[PDB]
A paper describes a structure:
Here, we report the structure of the F. tularensis enzyme and show that it is fused to 6-hydroxymethyl-7,8-dihydropterin pyrophosphokinase (FtHPPK) which catalyzes the previous step in the pathway.
Intriguingly, Compound 1 was also found within the pterin pocket of the FtHPPK module. However, comparing the ‘nitrogen faces’ of Compound 1 and DHP that dictate their similar binding to the DHP pocket, a rotation of ∼40° is revealed which orients the nitro moiety proximal to the Mg2+ ion within the divalent metal binding site. A consequence of this rotation is that the ‘nitrogen face’ does not directly engage residues 43–47 but instead interacts with loop H2 via a water molecule that occupies this void. Finally, in the absence of AMPcPP, residues 89–96 in loop H3 remain disordered, and Trp95 does not enclose the pterin pocket. Thus, while Compound 1 closely mimics the binding of substrate in the FtDHPS module, it only partially mimics substrate binding in the FtHPPK module. In contrast, the presence of the DHPS inhibitor in the pterin pocket of FtHPPK is very surprising and has important implications for drug discovery.
Author numbering: 1 to 45, 56 to 88, 97 to 215, 220 to 303, 325 to 350, 374 to 389, 391 to 422
The structure:
Amino acid sequence: MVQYIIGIGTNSGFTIENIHLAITALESQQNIRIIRKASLYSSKADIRFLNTAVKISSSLKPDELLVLLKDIELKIGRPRVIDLDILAAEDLILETDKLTIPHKELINRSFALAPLLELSKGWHHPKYVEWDLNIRLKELGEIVKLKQTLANTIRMGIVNLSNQSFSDGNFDDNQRKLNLDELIQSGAEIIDIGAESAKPISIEEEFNKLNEFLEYFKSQLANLIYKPLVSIDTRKLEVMQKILAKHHDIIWMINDVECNNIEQKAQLIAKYNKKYVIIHNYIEQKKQILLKHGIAQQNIYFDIGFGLKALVGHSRKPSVLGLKDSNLATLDRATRELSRKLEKLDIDIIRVHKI
Ligand SMILES: [Mg+2]
Protein backbone atom coordinates (compact mmCIF):
# COMPACT_ATOMS: atom_id res chain seq x y z
CA MET A 1 0.00 0.00 0.00
CA VAL A 2 1.32 3.37 -1.15
CA GLN A 3 -0.11 6.90 -1.11
CA TYR A 4 -0.29 8.68 -4.46
CA ILE A 5 -1.33 12.28 -5.23
CA ILE A 6 -3.15 12.26 -8.57
CA GLY A 7 -3.43 15.57 -10.42
CA ILE A 8 -6.60 16.06 -12.53
CA GLY A 9 -7.11 18.93 -14.96
CA THR A 10 -9.56 19.77 -17.75
CA ASN A 11 -10.51 22.68 -19.99
CA SER A 12 -13.18 21.13 -22.21
CA GLY A 13 -16.80 20.04 -22.12
CA PHE A 14 -18.62 19.84 -18.78
CA THR A 15 -15.47 20.58 -16.78
CA ILE A 16 -16.52 19.76 -13.22
CA GLU A 17 -18.32 16.68 -14.55
CA ASN A 18 -15.19 15.41 -16.25
CA ILE A 19 -13.32 15.84 -12.96
CA HIS A 20 -15.96 14.07 -10.89
CA LEU A 21 -15.96 11.21 -13.43
CA ALA A 22 -12.18 10.68 -13.38
CA ILE A 23 -12.45 10.50 -9.57
CA THR A 24 -15.36 8.04 -9.77
CA ALA A 25 -13.29 5.89 -12.16
CA LEU A 26 -10.39 5.70 -9.67
CA GLU A 27 -12.56 5.09 -6.61
CA SER A 28 -14.29 2.23 -8.48
CA GLN A 29 -10.99 0.32 -8.71
CA GLN A 30 -10.96 -2.48 -6.12
CA ASN A 31 -7.25 -1.75 -5.41
CA ILE A 32 -7.70 1.98 -4.75
CA ARG A 33 -9.07 3.90 -1.80
CA ILE A 34 -9.86 7.63 -2.07
CA ILE A 35 -8.39 9.40 0.98
CA ARG A 36 -8.98 13.09 0.22
CA LYS A 37 -9.92 15.41 -2.64
CA ALA A 38 -8.39 18.90 -2.92
CA SER A 39 -10.18 22.13 -3.73
CA LEU A 40 -10.86 23.29 -7.29
CA TYR A 41 -8.47 25.67 -9.02
CA SER A 42 -8.78 27.90 -12.08
CA SER A 43 -5.86 28.70 -14.38
CA LYS A 44 -5.68 30.10 -17.91
CA ALA A 45 -5.24 27.87 -20.97
CA ASP A 46 -8.90 28.84 -25.20
CA ILE A 47 -10.97 28.08 -22.14
CA ARG A 48 -10.11 28.28 -18.46
CA PHE A 49 -8.58 25.13 -16.91
CA LEU A 50 -10.18 23.41 -13.96
CA ASN A 51 -7.64 21.52 -11.83
CA THR A 52 -7.68 19.55 -8.59
CA ALA A 53 -5.82 16.63 -6.99
CA VAL A 54 -6.81 13.49 -5.08
CA LYS A 55 -4.84 11.61 -2.50
CA ILE A 56 -5.28 7.84 -2.90
CA SER A 57 -3.97 4.64 -1.34
CA SER A 58 -3.26 1.74 -3.65
CA SER A 59 -1.27 -1.47 -4.09
CA LEU A 60 -0.79 -0.48 -7.72
CA LYS A 61 2.83 -0.01 -8.82
CA PRO A 62 3.67 3.32 -10.38
CA ASP A 63 3.78 1.94 -13.96
CA GLU A 64 0.58 -0.06 -13.48
CA LEU A 65 -1.08 3.08 -12.13
CA LEU A 66 0.19 4.96 -15.17
CA VAL A 67 -1.63 2.34 -17.24
CA LEU A 68 -4.93 2.86 -15.33
CA LEU A 69 -4.72 6.63 -15.85
CA LYS A 70 -4.32 6.48 -19.64
CA ASP A 71 -7.30 4.10 -19.59
CA ILE A 72 -9.41 6.55 -17.64
CA GLU A 73 -8.24 9.31 -19.96
CA LEU A 74 -9.78 7.34 -22.83
CA LYS A 75 -13.06 6.59 -20.97
CA ILE A 76 -13.84 10.24 -20.24
CA GLY A 77 -12.84 10.64 -23.90
CA ARG A 78 -9.56 12.59 -24.07
CA PRO A 79 -8.59 21.95 -25.03
CA ARG A 80 -8.03 18.74 -23.06
CA VAL A 81 -11.10 16.92 -21.73
CA ILE A 82 -9.11 15.21 -18.99
CA ASP A 83 -5.46 15.13 -17.96
CA LEU A 84 -4.36 12.71 -15.22
CA ASP A 85 -0.82 12.77 -13.76
CA ILE A 86 0.85 10.99 -10.89
CA LEU A 87 2.02 14.04 -8.97
CA ALA A 88 3.86 12.28 -6.16
CA ALA A 89 4.10 9.15 -4.03
CA GLU A 90 5.42 9.97 -0.58
CA ASP A 91 9.17 10.21 -0.73
CA LEU A 92 9.35 8.09 -3.84
CA ILE A 93 11.84 9.07 -6.51
CA LEU A 94 11.52 7.33 -9.86
CA GLU A 95 13.14 8.04 -13.22
CA THR A 96 12.13 6.11 -16.29
CA ASP A 97 11.49 7.31 -19.84
CA LYS A 98 7.98 6.04 -19.12
CA LEU A 99 7.50 8.14 -15.98
CA THR A 100 9.11 10.39 -13.43
CA ILE A 101 7.95 10.73 -9.84
CA PRO A 102 7.55 13.29 -8.60
CA HIS A 103 6.07 14.61 -11.82
CA LYS A 104 8.76 16.60 -13.66
CA GLU A 105 6.55 19.72 -13.83
CA LEU A 106 5.02 19.51 -10.29
CA ILE A 107 7.26 22.41 -9.21
CA ASN A 108 6.57 24.48 -12.36
CA ARG A 109 2.77 24.30 -12.30
CA SER A 110 0.88 26.06 -9.50
CA PHE A 111 -2.33 24.27 -10.57
CA ALA A 112 -0.52 21.04 -9.78
CA LEU A 113 1.47 22.14 -6.76
CA ALA A 114 -1.29 24.08 -4.98
CA PRO A 115 -3.75 21.17 -4.70
CA LEU A 116 -0.88 18.80 -3.74
CA LEU A 117 0.22 20.96 -0.81
CA GLU A 118 -3.43 21.43 0.14
CA LEU A 119 -3.53 17.65 0.47
CA SER A 120 -0.09 17.33 2.11
CA LYS A 121 0.90 20.60 3.74
CA GLY A 122 4.02 18.93 5.12
CA TRP A 123 5.15 17.53 1.74
CA HIS A 124 8.75 17.98 0.62
CA HIS A 125 10.13 17.06 -2.81
CA PRO A 126 12.41 14.06 -2.06
CA LYS A 127 14.94 15.21 -4.67
CA TYR A 128 15.10 18.60 -2.94
CA VAL A 129 14.40 18.02 0.74
CA GLU A 130 15.51 21.55 1.57
CA TRP A 131 13.17 23.32 -0.86
CA ASP A 132 10.33 24.87 1.06
CA LEU A 133 7.54 24.44 -1.46
CA ASN A 134 5.31 27.09 0.11
CA ILE A 135 7.90 29.62 -1.07
CA ARG A 136 7.97 28.07 -4.51
CA LEU A 137 4.18 28.05 -4.80
CA LYS A 138 4.09 31.80 -4.20
CA GLU A 139 6.89 32.37 -6.73
CA LEU A 140 4.71 30.59 -9.27
CA GLY A 141 2.25 33.39 -8.62
CA GLU A 142 -1.14 33.26 -10.37
CA ILE A 143 -3.77 30.86 -9.07
CA VAL A 144 -7.50 31.09 -8.27
CA LYS A 145 -8.94 28.76 -5.67
CA LEU A 146 -12.63 28.44 -6.54
CA LYS A 147 -15.62 28.28 -4.20
CA GLN A 148 -17.12 25.55 -6.40
CA THR A 149 -16.35 22.20 -4.82
CA LEU A 150 -16.42 18.50 -5.47
CA ALA A 151 -19.02 18.11 -2.71
CA ASN A 152 -21.95 15.70 -3.03
CA THR A 153 -24.46 18.55 -3.03
CA ILE A 154 -24.10 20.69 -6.10
CA ARG A 155 -25.40 24.27 -5.99
CA MET A 156 -27.59 25.41 -8.91
CA GLY A 157 -27.68 29.18 -9.37
CA ILE A 158 -30.92 30.76 -10.57
CA VAL A 159 -30.65 33.19 -13.50
CA ASN A 160 -34.09 34.61 -14.22
CA LEU A 161 -34.47 36.70 -17.38
CA SER A 162 -38.19 37.48 -16.83
CA ASN A 163 -39.68 40.82 -15.78
CA GLN A 164 -39.14 40.11 -12.07
CA SER A 165 -35.51 41.12 -12.57
CA PHE A 166 -35.84 44.47 -14.33
CA SER A 167 -33.66 47.47 -13.62
CA ASP A 168 -32.23 48.17 -17.08
CA GLY A 169 -30.97 51.75 -17.36
CA ASN A 170 -30.67 54.18 -20.24
CA PHE A 171 -27.65 52.52 -21.84
CA ASP A 172 -27.13 49.29 -19.91
CA ASP A 173 -28.66 45.82 -19.83
CA ASN A 174 -25.95 44.54 -17.50
CA GLN A 175 -27.99 43.22 -14.52
CA ARG A 176 -28.36 39.53 -15.60
CA LYS A 177 -24.67 39.51 -16.53
CA LEU A 178 -23.74 40.92 -13.16
CA ASN A 179 -25.96 38.25 -11.63
CA LEU A 180 -24.26 35.45 -13.51
CA ASP A 181 -20.91 36.79 -12.29
CA GLU A 182 -21.86 36.96 -8.62
CA LEU A 183 -23.25 33.42 -8.72
CA ILE A 184 -20.12 32.06 -10.39
CA GLN A 185 -17.82 33.80 -7.92
CA SER A 186 -19.74 32.56 -4.89
CA GLY A 187 -19.40 28.98 -6.08
CA ALA A 188 -22.50 27.93 -8.02
CA GLU A 189 -21.54 24.66 -9.73
CA ILE A 190 -24.60 24.88 -11.99
CA ILE A 191 -26.68 27.67 -13.52
CA ASP A 192 -30.41 27.45 -14.25
CA ILE A 193 -31.57 30.02 -16.78
CA GLY A 194 -35.28 30.59 -17.22
CA ALA A 195 -37.02 33.42 -19.07
CA GLU A 196 -40.45 33.63 -17.47
CA SER A 197 -41.83 34.93 -14.17
CA ALA A 198 -47.86 37.43 -14.98
CA LYS A 199 -48.78 37.86 -18.65
CA PRO A 200 -47.95 34.68 -20.65
CA ILE A 201 -45.01 34.76 -23.07
CA SER A 202 -44.74 33.38 -26.58
CA ILE A 203 -42.41 30.60 -27.70
CA GLU A 204 -40.61 33.02 -29.96
CA GLU A 205 -40.01 35.55 -27.19
CA GLU A 206 -39.14 32.97 -24.57
CA PHE A 207 -36.69 31.59 -27.12
CA ASN A 208 -35.29 35.06 -27.87
CA LYS A 209 -34.36 35.80 -24.23
CA LEU A 210 -32.79 32.36 -23.69
CA ASN A 211 -30.83 32.44 -26.96
CA GLU A 212 -29.45 35.99 -26.45
CA PHE A 213 -28.16 35.00 -23.06
CA LEU A 214 -26.64 31.66 -24.13
CA GLU A 215 -24.91 33.43 -27.05
CA TYR A 216 -23.64 35.90 -24.49
CA PHE A 217 -22.45 33.02 -22.28
CA LYS A 218 -20.55 31.45 -25.22
CA SER A 219 -18.90 34.77 -25.99
CA GLN A 220 -17.62 34.77 -22.39
CA LEU A 221 -16.38 31.20 -22.27
CA ALA A 222 -12.67 32.12 -22.04
CA ASN A 223 -13.45 34.92 -19.55
CA LEU A 224 -15.14 32.72 -16.91
CA ILE A 225 -12.91 31.58 -14.00
CA TYR A 226 -15.30 28.61 -13.91
CA LYS A 227 -17.59 27.40 -16.75
CA PRO A 228 -20.75 26.27 -14.98
CA LEU A 229 -23.02 23.43 -16.07
CA VAL A 230 -26.10 24.85 -17.77
CA SER A 231 -29.69 24.02 -16.89
CA ILE A 232 -32.47 25.42 -19.04
CA ASP A 233 -35.58 26.33 -17.13
CA THR A 234 -38.65 26.09 -19.49
CA ARG A 235 -41.97 24.26 -19.72
CA LYS A 236 -42.33 24.79 -23.47
CA LEU A 237 -41.57 21.90 -25.82
CA GLU A 238 -40.73 24.11 -28.79
CA VAL A 239 -38.41 26.28 -26.72
CA MET A 240 -36.45 23.13 -25.73
CA GLN A 241 -36.40 22.09 -29.40
CA LYS A 242 -34.96 25.35 -30.65
CA ILE A 243 -32.66 26.01 -27.71
CA LEU A 244 -31.22 22.50 -27.75
CA ALA A 245 -30.78 22.63 -31.55
CA LYS A 246 -28.70 25.79 -31.21
CA HIS A 247 -26.92 25.24 -27.89
CA HIS A 248 -26.99 21.58 -26.94
CA ASP A 249 -23.14 21.62 -26.67
CA ILE A 250 -23.21 23.81 -23.56
CA ILE A 251 -26.45 22.66 -21.93
CA TRP A 252 -26.33 19.99 -19.22
CA MET A 253 -29.90 19.86 -18.04
CA ILE A 254 -33.54 20.63 -18.85
CA ASN A 255 -35.64 21.72 -15.88
CA ASP A 256 -39.35 21.66 -16.69
CA VAL A 257 -41.96 22.70 -14.08
CA GLU A 258 -45.07 21.81 -16.03
CA CYS A 259 -45.82 18.70 -18.00
CA ASN A 260 -47.49 18.77 -21.36
CA ASN A 261 -46.07 16.93 -24.34
CA ILE A 262 -44.08 14.90 -21.82
CA GLU A 263 -44.03 12.31 -24.60
CA GLN A 264 -42.27 14.41 -27.24
CA LYS A 265 -40.17 16.03 -24.54
CA ALA A 266 -38.60 12.69 -23.56
CA GLN A 267 -38.07 11.83 -27.20
CA LEU A 268 -36.19 15.12 -27.40
CA ILE A 269 -34.09 14.72 -24.26
CA ALA A 270 -33.16 11.23 -25.39
CA LYS A 271 -31.84 12.38 -28.76
CA TYR A 272 -29.83 14.98 -26.87
CA ASN A 273 -28.84 12.77 -23.96
CA LYS A 274 -29.47 15.42 -21.34
CA LYS A 275 -30.49 15.44 -17.69
CA TYR A 276 -34.20 15.82 -16.91
CA VAL A 277 -36.04 16.78 -13.72
CA ILE A 278 -39.47 15.84 -12.39
CA ILE A 279 -41.46 18.41 -10.48
CA HIS A 280 -44.72 18.28 -8.53
CA ASN A 281 -46.88 19.60 -9.79
CA TYR A 282 -46.94 9.87 -9.41
CA ILE A 283 -43.31 10.66 -10.29
CA GLU A 284 -43.24 6.98 -11.14
CA GLN A 285 -45.65 7.16 -14.08
CA LYS A 286 -43.63 10.00 -15.59
CA LYS A 287 -40.36 8.17 -14.91
CA GLN A 288 -41.70 5.16 -16.78
CA ILE A 289 -42.68 7.26 -19.80
CA LEU A 290 -39.25 8.87 -19.85
CA LEU A 291 -37.61 5.50 -19.18
CA LYS A 292 -39.80 4.16 -21.98
CA HIS A 293 -38.89 6.72 -24.63
CA GLY A 294 -35.22 5.95 -24.03
CA ILE A 295 -34.19 8.07 -21.06
CA ALA A 296 -31.50 6.50 -18.87
CA GLN A 297 -32.72 6.51 -15.27
CA GLN A 298 -29.53 8.02 -13.85
CA ASN A 299 -29.97 11.08 -16.08
CA ILE A 300 -33.12 12.02 -14.20
CA TYR A 301 -33.87 13.93 -11.02
CA PHE A 302 -37.07 14.49 -9.09
CA ASP A 303 -38.22 17.61 -7.28
CA ILE A 304 -41.03 17.56 -4.74
CA GLY A 305 -42.04 21.08 -5.74
CA PHE A 306 -42.52 23.67 -3.02
CA GLY A 307 -45.30 25.54 -4.86
CA LEU A 308 -33.92 8.89 -8.67
CA LYS A 309 -31.58 11.67 -7.45
CA ALA A 310 -33.01 14.63 -5.55
CA LEU A 311 -33.19 18.26 -6.57
CA VAL A 312 -34.77 20.68 -4.11
CA GLY A 313 -35.91 24.19 -4.95
CA HIS A 314 -36.44 26.08 -1.72
CA SER A 315 -34.73 29.41 -2.27
CA ARG A 316 -36.66 32.50 -1.20
CA LYS A 317 -39.80 30.41 -0.59
CA PRO A 318 -41.66 31.58 2.56
CA SER A 319 -43.88 28.52 2.98
CA VAL A 320 -40.70 26.49 3.54
CA LEU A 321 -38.58 29.01 5.44
CA GLY A 322 -41.61 29.97 7.51
CA LEU A 323 -43.61 32.49 5.47
CA LYS A 324 -43.84 37.24 3.52
CA ASP A 325 -43.13 40.98 3.80
CA SER A 326 -39.55 39.91 4.58
CA ASN A 327 -36.75 41.48 2.56
CA LEU A 328 -34.39 39.61 0.21
CA ALA A 329 -31.51 40.04 2.65
CA THR A 330 -33.66 37.96 5.02
CA LEU A 331 -35.23 35.52 2.58
CA ASP A 332 -31.76 34.39 1.54
CA ARG A 333 -30.59 33.91 5.13
CA ALA A 334 -33.32 31.35 5.82
CA THR A 335 -32.36 29.69 2.52
CA ARG A 336 -28.59 29.95 3.06
CA GLU A 337 -28.95 28.41 6.53
CA LEU A 338 -31.32 25.71 5.28
CA SER A 339 -29.00 25.12 2.30
CA ARG A 340 -26.20 24.54 4.81
CA LYS A 341 -28.37 21.78 6.27
CA LEU A 342 -29.38 19.96 3.06
CA GLU A 343 -25.74 19.77 2.04
CA LYS A 344 -25.15 17.88 5.30
CA LEU A 345 -27.90 15.54 4.20
CA ASP A 346 -27.54 13.61 0.95
CA ILE A 347 -29.12 16.30 -1.26
CA ASP A 348 -27.83 15.99 -4.82
CA ILE A 349 -28.82 19.44 -6.11
CA ILE A 350 -30.20 22.60 -4.50
CA ARG A 351 -31.57 25.52 -6.52
CA VAL A 352 -30.76 28.93 -5.00
CA HIS A 353 -30.54 32.67 -5.72
CA LYS A 354 -27.64 33.12 -3.33
CA ILE A 355 -25.03 30.49 -2.43
MG1 LIG B 1 -0.36 13.94 -18.94
